[PDB]
Amino acid sequence: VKPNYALKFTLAGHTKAVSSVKFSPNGEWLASSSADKLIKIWGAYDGKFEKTISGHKLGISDVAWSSDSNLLVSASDDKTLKIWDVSSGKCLKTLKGHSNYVFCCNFNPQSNLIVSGSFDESVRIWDVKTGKCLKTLPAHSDPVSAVHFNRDGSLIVSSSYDGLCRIWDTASGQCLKTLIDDNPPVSFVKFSPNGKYILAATLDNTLKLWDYSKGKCLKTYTGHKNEKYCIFANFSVTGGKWIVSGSEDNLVYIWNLQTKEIVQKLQGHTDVVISTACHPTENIIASAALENDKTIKLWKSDC
């Protein structure tokens, strides 16, 4: 009925606010990015520090894994993304074209494409092999807070401070849907793993589950604090079905997906929990916090 997530490891190393944490698809590794301009790789199960990857000229707001767990892409205030070979630590490509901070990024499931969102208000689609920008979408009228591919890579969902979520055809770049509620800034969005929903965060302390085909809100989740930061949210589906999110009161919130009831509040961080990630095969949550904390935490549950 309720999970029992408990703190197992605290990962210290970044010297500035952590921005994003992500588990590799194969479940072996955790990648973290930070305002200290570094990417760090840790063991997903024991939190053991593995290596530091560097190269960006300014700090990093997001990092994301390719489907084979070999490549990373990062989004930086230096207006570029970088594609990394994790095993070598090498920067393979630097993706140039955005005219302002790059804020969010993701590979498609095939991992031949990368999608990025920027303060320049555009979404760009990049070729992984060549590093070339294939399409620039005039996606929003304000910073783009999140971008994500669906299960088969045919769709992209984007969110922005303009208050909109938009669904894009990957192949043509056509906007297929604009989601409009009864218009607070949208600070995060992603497709559900089964592909039938998107989960959207807005800066009015609200998470919303949408049927993006019907353009209808199914569930809402509240009780947490989120008015200032683009905090990652997740579907947890390895055990029970939960929604997981960070919060500006320093807690990790966990909701029952169906009933919308808060089932757990994880205490430990000493600053805003900017990022949470759910492990692909096991009941494990990674969380990370901002400047006054700078640590990453691994929590484990029996369901």
């Binding site: 010297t15 500035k16 606010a17 952590v18 921005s19 994003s20 990015s33 930070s34 305002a35 200290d36 301009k37 000229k57 300014l58 700090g59 990093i60 707001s61 997001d62 930086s76 205030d77 901070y101 804020f103 303060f119 910073p143 401070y161 800034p185 600070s187 800066l203 200032k228 930061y229 683009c230 900017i274 901002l290 400047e291």
Partner: peptide, 14 residues
């Protein structure tokens, strides 16, 4: 001065 990232700064709405 180079250790800056947009996600780690709050939104400025006023």
């Amino acid at each position: 001065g180079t250790c800056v990232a947009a996600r780690t700064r709050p939104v400025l709405s006023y």
